[PDB]
Design a protein around this ligand. Structure first.
Ligand SMILES: Nc1nc2c(ncn2[C@@H]2O[C@H](COP(=O)(O)OP(=O)(O)O)[C@@H](O)[C@H]2O)c(=O)[nH]1
Ligand SMILES: [Mg+2]
Length: 413
């Protein structure tokens, strides 16, 4: 069935390593074996939107994806360590071997020399009904931050009629590299201008959720499961079946409030049996299960909830009451939910929540403080200016980043 095709772009080491469990989950949920490119079993549901993310070739199924990196480390993990070279094939790879050295500026400039090849691969291989792009990358490093920002800017300019969606991973607040605040602010500034929707993931939060319920390749593994769950409304029929622009409209009230906090429940099969339906819905609105490190509840501007599996009104009334919404949103509005018949392969039921919440200003404020604690003392700036990002550029991106925090702060009250 032609239509609603999406091209996924993995940029940087973290973004490509996430692609393993992201594409394995999507393959398994669509009755597809990622190791052989073929269907798992004869059991096939009569309606299935596999073509949204998967290309059907005569030999089998392949991901509609490009794997872009300035070093071959993450690609070697996919092909050599995981032995999935027939799925992550060489025709979908755009690689250099110079590296970004964890500097946003280096990934932006060096990635420009790969832009012509990427744009030609898109126009040569993508269908005309392609609805948009999904960019998966981290913000703390150099490639995923800089090259990812470059790709977000390039795809919006070259394809104005198509949506650009970002799944962006935030650095660890307490245990991450020195240059992470600079790269994060630079990336978030670029995404606010050229992205249609930015779904944020924070390594600080994912570590918290796993420990409190109870191996780096186990974090990106768990991020892929969540990223796949967020795209479920794009891949299955139901009351919440959306496309890229519908997903954006239902959350972006103002053009600047495009940063989304996702939450999912359950996260481990030990919690799956240990939890009922509303246990998962209450945990989705609980800031402990937010994919970004939040301290409080926060005001909800717009949110989209989804049930998956066998769930079978009573859920909404008691929950919508206890949820703090932004001033001026309607009491009958601000929250949309629905049931999806498809379920994750590991859990009998699952609840996902995408929330445009004002508490993201608190998350962005901590990023700004770490940025200022280094920038006000001219620390670690020497290699950004040698790569084409002046000290004045770091400030302008910072001030533009602060304007975003204030917009969310005004909507809160
Ligand atoms: N969750 C997760 N985060 C990662 C992973 N790899 C890197 N990161 C984050 O990304 C930052 C490093 O950027 P990285 O992607 O490794 O370098 P890049 O090639 O320049 O994009 C660090 O601050 C990490 O927090 C991963 O596999 N999973
Ligand atoms: Mg690295």
């Amino acid at each position: 069935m032609p239509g609603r095709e999406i091209l996924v772009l993995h940029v940087g080491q973290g973004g490509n390593q996430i692609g393993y469990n992201f594409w394995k989950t999507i393959c398994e949920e669509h009755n597809i074996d990622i190791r052989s490119n073929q269907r798992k079993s004869v059991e096939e549901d009569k309606v299935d939107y596999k073509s949204v993310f998967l290309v059907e070739a005569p030999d089998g199924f392949h991901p509609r994806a490009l794997f872009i990196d300035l070093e071959p480390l993450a690609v070697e993990f996919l092909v050599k360590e995981m032995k999935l070279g027939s799925f992550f094939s060489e025709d979908l790879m755009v690689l250099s071997y110079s590296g970004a050295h964890n500097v946003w500026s280096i990934g932006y400039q060096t990635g420009k020399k790969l832009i012509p090849v990427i744009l030609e691969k898109i126009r040569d291989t993508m269908p005309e009904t392609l609805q948009g792009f999904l960019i998966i990358h981290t913000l703390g490093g150099g490639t995923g931050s800089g090259f990812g920002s470059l790709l977000t800017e390039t795809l919006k300019k070259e394809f104005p009629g198509k949506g650009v969606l970002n799944f962006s991973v935030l650095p660890s607040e307490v245990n991450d590299v020195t240059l992470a605040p600079y790269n994060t602010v630079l990336s978030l500034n670029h995404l606010s201008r050229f992205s249609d929707l930015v779904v944020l993931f924070d390594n600080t939060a994912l570590i918290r959720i796993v420990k409190d319920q109870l191996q780096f390749s186990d974090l990106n593994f768990l991020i892929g499961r969540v990223m796949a769950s967020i795209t479920a409304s794009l891949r299955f029929p139901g009351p919440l079946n959306m496309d890229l622009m519908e997903m954006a409209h239902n959350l972006v009230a103002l053009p600047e409030t495009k940063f989304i906090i996702p939450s999912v429940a359950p996260l481990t099969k030990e919690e799956s049996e240990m939890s009922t339906e509303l246990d998962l819905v209450e945990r989705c609105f609980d800031p402990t299960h937010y994919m970004v490190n939040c301290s409080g509840q926060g005001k909800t501007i717009s949110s989209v909830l989804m049930f998956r599996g066998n769930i079978a009104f009573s859920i909404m009334t008691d929950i919508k009451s206890n949820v703090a919404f932004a001033p001026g949103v309607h009491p009958d509005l601000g929250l949309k939910y629905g049931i999806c018949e498809s379920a994750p392969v590991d859990f009998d039921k699952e609840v996902t929540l995408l929330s445009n919440n004002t508490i993201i200003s608190e998350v962005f404020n901590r990023v700004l403080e770490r940025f200022d604690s280094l920038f006000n003392r001219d620390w670690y700036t020497s290699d950004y200016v040698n790569a084409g990002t002046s000290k004045s550029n770091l400030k302008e991106a910072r001030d533009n980043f602060d304007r975003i925090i204030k917009i969310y702060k005004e909507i809160e009250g």
